[PDB]
Design a protein around this ligand. Structure first.
Ligand SMILES: Cc1cnc(Nc2ccc(N3CCN(C)CC3)cc2)nc1Nc1ccc(Cl)c(NS(=O)(=O)C(C)(C)C)c1
Length: 127
């Protein structure tokens, strides 16, 4: 009957940077996925109360979504590109853990993940 608080998106004491790689992760990677026709189920934390999935946050213990990633990038929350890439991978993996192969939600994640991988293949060299 309860959703957890969302993942952290603000922390003044956290070491953080703007790098050219992190800029690419916002301007290219996040922007490309966000505009996709299948983005919407991933644009905010899963509301497991509204979806009637009482097991969701009992099974998915490291939730992640693109709304959170977008805020983190906009706030320059990350230290490096790998931290942000990990958030995307957590989001995709969580989808495949929770759902059945071939479910619509899985097909949607797979389309986003394909694009993600194509974009990160061209992640620029740092600095
Ligand atoms: C990120 C994410 C990961 N996993 C799941 N899993 C999930 C599993 C079973 C359901 N239900 C269960 C019983 N219902 C009658 C059918 C769907 C919903 C979501 N959702 C996610 N987001 C999400 C957000 C908003 C909505 Cl409306 C949905 N619904 S949906 O998946 O059915 C679809 C997008 C295909 C319409 C999903």
């Amino acid at each position: 009957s309860m959703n957890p608080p969302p993942p952290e998106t603000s922390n003044p004491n956290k070491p953080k940077r703007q790098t050219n790689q992190l800029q690419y992760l916002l301007r290219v990677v996040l922007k490309t996925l966000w505009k996709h026709q299948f983005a919407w189920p991933f644009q905010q934390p899963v509301d497991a109360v509204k979806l009637n999935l009482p097991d969701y946050y009992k099974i998915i213990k490291t939730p992640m979504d693109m709304g959170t990633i977008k805020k983190r990038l906009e706030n320059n929350y990350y230290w490096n590109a790998q931290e942000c890439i990990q958030d995307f991978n957590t989001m995709f993996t969580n989808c495949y853990i929770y759902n059945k192969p071939g479910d619509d939600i899985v097909l949607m994640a797979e389309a986003l993940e394909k694009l993600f991988l194509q974009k990160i293949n061209e992640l620029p060299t740092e600095e």
